Design an enzyme around this catalytic site. Sequence first.
Site, PDB file in Angstrom:
ATOM      1  N   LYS A  62     -39.504 105.197   0.862  1.00 45.02           N
ATOM      2  CA  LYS A  62     -40.875 105.581   0.487  1.00 45.02           C
ATOM      3  C   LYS A  62     -41.243 105.037  -0.872  1.00 45.02           C
ATOM      4  O   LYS A  62     -41.773 105.729  -1.738  1.00 45.02           O
ATOM      5  CB  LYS A  62     -41.086 107.132   0.549  1.00 45.02           C
ATOM      6  N   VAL A  63     -40.931 103.753  -1.103  1.00 50.01           N
ATOM      7  CA  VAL A  63     -40.961 103.185  -2.437  1.00 50.01           C
ATOM      8  C   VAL A  63     -42.383 103.328  -2.981  1.00 50.01           C
ATOM      9  O   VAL A  63     -43.353 102.948  -2.312  1.00 50.01           O
ATOM     10  CB  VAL A  63     -40.512 101.717  -2.413  1.00 50.01           C
ATOM     11  N   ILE A  66     -44.257 101.433  -9.832  1.00 46.63           N
ATOM     12  CA  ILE A  66     -44.960 100.263 -10.344  1.00 46.63           C
ATOM     13  C   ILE A  66     -44.262  99.019  -9.804  1.00 46.63           C
ATOM     14  O   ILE A  66     -43.112  99.051  -9.375  1.00 46.63           O
ATOM     15  CB  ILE A  66     -44.994 100.270 -11.888  1.00 46.63           C
ATOM     16  N   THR A  69     -40.587  98.110 -11.110  1.00 48.99           N
ATOM     17  CA  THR A  69     -39.535  99.020 -10.652  1.00 48.99           C
ATOM     18  C   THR A  69     -39.332  98.904  -9.170  1.00 48.99           C
ATOM     19  O   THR A  69     -38.205  98.941  -8.676  1.00 48.99           O
ATOM     20  CB  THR A  69     -39.871 100.459 -11.064  1.00 48.99           C
ATOM     21  N   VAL A 172     -41.899 113.252  15.646  1.00 48.22           N
ATOM     22  CA  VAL A 172     -41.591 113.589  17.026  1.00 48.22           C
ATOM     23  C   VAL A 172     -40.589 114.703  17.049  1.00 48.22           C
ATOM     24  O   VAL A 172     -39.535 114.614  16.384  1.00 48.22           O
ATOM     25  CB  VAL A 172     -41.040 112.376  17.759  1.00 48.22           C
ATOM     26  N   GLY A 176     -43.630 118.475  15.798  1.00 51.20           N
ATOM     27  CA  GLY A 176     -44.587 118.771  16.866  1.00 51.20           C
ATOM     28  C   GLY A 176     -45.050 117.571  17.657  1.00 51.20           C
ATOM     29  O   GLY A 176     -45.771 117.754  18.664  1.00 51.20           O
ATOM     30  N   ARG A 193     -34.299 115.733  13.335  1.00 49.91           N
ATOM     31  CA  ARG A 193     -33.734 117.055  13.594  1.00 49.91           C
ATOM     32  C   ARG A 193     -33.587 117.357  15.085  1.00 49.91           C
ATOM     33  O   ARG A 193     -32.582 118.008  15.452  1.00 49.91           O
ATOM     34  CB  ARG A 193     -34.574 118.134  12.903  1.00 49.91           C
TER      35      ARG A 193
HETATM   36  O1  LIG Z   1     -47.083 105.767 -13.419  1.00 54.03           O
HETATM   37  C1  LIG Z   1     -45.876 105.567 -13.666  1.00 54.03           C
HETATM   38  C2  LIG Z   1     -44.787 106.358 -13.271  1.00 54.03           C
HETATM   39  C3  LIG Z   1     -43.519 106.092 -13.702  1.00 54.03           C
HETATM   40  N1  LIG Z   1     -43.267 104.878 -14.387  1.00 54.03           N
HETATM   41  C4  LIG Z   1     -41.904 104.578 -14.783  1.00 54.03           C
HETATM   42  O2  LIG Z   1     -41.793 104.657 -16.194  1.00 54.03           O
HETATM   43  C5  LIG Z   1     -41.010 103.551 -16.673  1.00 54.03           C
HETATM   44  C6  LIG Z   1     -41.869 102.571 -17.452  1.00 54.03           C
HETATM   45  O3  LIG Z   1     -40.961 101.716 -18.102  1.00 54.03           O
HETATM   46  P1  LIG Z   1     -41.463 100.505 -19.046  1.00 54.03           P
HETATM   47  O4  LIG Z   1     -42.766  99.971 -18.481  1.00 54.03           O
HETATM   48  O5  LIG Z   1     -41.645 101.062 -20.429  1.00 54.03           O
HETATM   49  O6  LIG Z   1     -40.313  99.538 -18.952  1.00 54.03           O
HETATM   50  C7  LIG Z   1     -40.346 102.955 -15.462  1.00 54.03           C
HETATM   51  O7  LIG Z   1     -39.163 103.690 -15.159  1.00 54.03           O
HETATM   52  C8  LIG Z   1     -41.361 103.224 -14.363  1.00 54.03           C
HETATM   53  O8  LIG Z   1     -40.749 103.264 -13.108  1.00 54.03           O
HETATM   54  C9  LIG Z   1     -44.318 104.064 -14.780  1.00 54.03           C
HETATM   55  O9  LIG Z   1     -44.136 103.073 -15.464  1.00 54.03           O
HETATM   56  N2  LIG Z   1     -45.562 104.437 -14.399  1.00 54.03           N
HETATM   57  O1  LIG Z   2     -44.830 110.357   7.350  1.00 52.70           O
HETATM   58  C1  LIG Z   2     -43.583 110.393   7.367  1.00 52.70           C
HETATM   59  C2  LIG Z   2     -42.699 109.470   6.787  1.00 52.70           C
HETATM   60  C3  LIG Z   2     -41.350 109.561   6.973  1.00 52.70           C
HETATM   61  N1  LIG Z   2     -40.818 110.722   7.585  1.00 52.70           N
HETATM   62  C4  LIG Z   2     -39.377 110.835   7.718  1.00 52.70           C
HETATM   63  O2  LIG Z   2     -39.019 110.725   9.085  1.00 52.70           O
HETATM   64  C5  LIG Z   2     -38.022 111.711   9.397  1.00 52.70           C
HETATM   65  C6  LIG Z   2     -38.585 112.786  10.310  1.00 52.70           C
HETATM   66  O3  LIG Z   2     -37.467 113.506  10.770  1.00 52.70           O
HETATM   67  P1  LIG Z   2     -37.622 114.761  11.775  1.00 52.70           P
HETATM   68  O4  LIG Z   2     -38.925 115.470  11.454  1.00 52.70           O
HETATM   69  O5  LIG Z   2     -37.617 114.216  13.175  1.00 52.70           O
HETATM   70  O6  LIG Z   2     -36.392 115.569  11.458  1.00 52.70           O
HETATM   71  C7  LIG Z   2     -37.520 112.230   8.077  1.00 52.70           C
HETATM   72  O7  LIG Z   2     -36.521 111.349   7.570  1.00 52.70           O
HETATM   73  C8  LIG Z   2     -38.748 112.111   7.189  1.00 52.70           C
HETATM   74  O8  LIG Z   2     -38.389 112.006   5.842  1.00 52.70           O
HETATM   75  C9  LIG Z   2     -41.661 111.663   8.155  1.00 52.70           C
HETATM   76  O9  LIG Z   2     -41.226 112.613   8.781  1.00 52.70           O
HETATM   77  N2  LIG Z   2     -42.992 111.462   8.015  1.00 52.70           N
END
Ligand SMILES: O=c1ccn([C@@H]2O[C@H](COP(=O)(O)O)[C@@H](O)[C@H]2O)c(=O)[nH]1
Ligand SMILES: O=c1ccn([C@@H]2O[C@H](COP(=O)(O)O)[C@@H](O)[C@H]2O)c(=O)[nH]1
Lengths: 215, 215
Positions: A62-63, A66, A69, A172, A176, A193
Amino acid sequence: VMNRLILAMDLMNRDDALRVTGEVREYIDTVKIGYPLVLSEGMDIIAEFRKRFGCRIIADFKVADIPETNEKICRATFKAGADAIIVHGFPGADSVRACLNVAEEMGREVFLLTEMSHPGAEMFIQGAADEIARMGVDLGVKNYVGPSTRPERLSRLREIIGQDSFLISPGVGAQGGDPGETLRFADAIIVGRSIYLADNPAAAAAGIIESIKDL
Amino acid sequence: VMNRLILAMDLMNRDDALRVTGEVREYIDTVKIGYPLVLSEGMDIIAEFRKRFGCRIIADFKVADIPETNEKICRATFKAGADAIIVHGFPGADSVRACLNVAEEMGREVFLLTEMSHPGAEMFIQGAADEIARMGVDLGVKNYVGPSTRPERLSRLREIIGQDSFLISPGVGAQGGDPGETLRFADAIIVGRSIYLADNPAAAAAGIIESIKDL
Ligand SMILES: O=c1ccn([C@@H]2O[C@H](COP(=O)(O)O)[C@@H](O)[C@H]2O)c(=O)[nH]1
Ligand SMILES: O=c1ccn([C@@H]2O[C@H](COP(=O)(O)O)[C@@H](O)[C@H]2O)c(=O)[nH]1
């Protein structure tokens, strides 16, 4: 994806995770691994799975950072052996493109998460989701994630991304959603699950596929 | 926070991360650890830091899943020794409350990320950010994250959360934000690359604090 079924392996114990995945391996060819397992057992769990089971691995991270990072997260994840990574689209296009750039460098794939399956997704994500999907099409994303719990939304997603894009769908079972209804729009369903907490995971998986084939 | 300065330790090598953090420890009392370091070196790095340096640790995991998975992520993170975790608000209130519930159980804290600092944040997050912050106030969140790169936004955030809430802000230095301007609204600034990629991290940190005190 074998049988159109992807296992969400969110057990937090390596022994349990390995047991269940082994019991259902005959039914899937892809395992989705997320932070519950990786942050409990380490990133080395990816290569152990991929090897032990021969499966493909989608890292559901779920990356959502910024761009700079995000590139680091993606490169760590692909170094660990993941085949693909799931990326949030809500942080915008630069953050997605960062992920795409690393995937291109390392010969891997990005899945764009555009609407989530839980109730809270209605508050902010749902109203942005069509535009997030369109952003993905404009960035050249070919792989998407959208919600089993809202098949009308999943249909609208499919209509934006077209038939040639690959769409997988969680929610699924426990949340539900229905296998057969979801597969009207998605190429594959994600199930956690309902399989891994079953008294007999293999029987749970078999039963789901008996549904899917009946489609 | 010592000197109102939190180190973002996003080096991906344990030896480098330990070197730099040790060199700047006299200037901070909190380290923000994220996925670049944890997914390269393991969650055990948290307890090693917290012990070696005596520092508090904020896990910048941008938690952005469904409620059930969020609880698992939080519990793994607090088990590893983090003092606090950063949570996205864009997934909605149930997802945030899941995190708050685990923090309450384990005696830890949640920071709510309401507007991000990078350019892409303008696409979707910014238009939701005031409502995300208000959601946080309504959930009882006391700790927030908002963007150094947009001090007018950071001011609006502060106006929603009030003076008693704690506000930390990334985007200082490399992303273009200014320490003193950010500290007009935030209680503490987060600084990564301007410190950890400096030829002399300690001198970089000292120089920033010389600015902060001059406030
Ligand atoms: O809105 C956000 C949320 C978190 N970070 C995090 O804060 C740090 C910013 O680092 P730098 O830009 O000072 O290197 C990084 O760890 C980045 O992932 C942001 O920069 N912006
Ligand atoms: O919108 C999203 C995105 C990803 N997951 C992920 O999919 C899986 C759902 O698992 P389950 O509800 O079948 O146990 C979990 O890993 C959950 O983090 C969701 O459920 N919904």
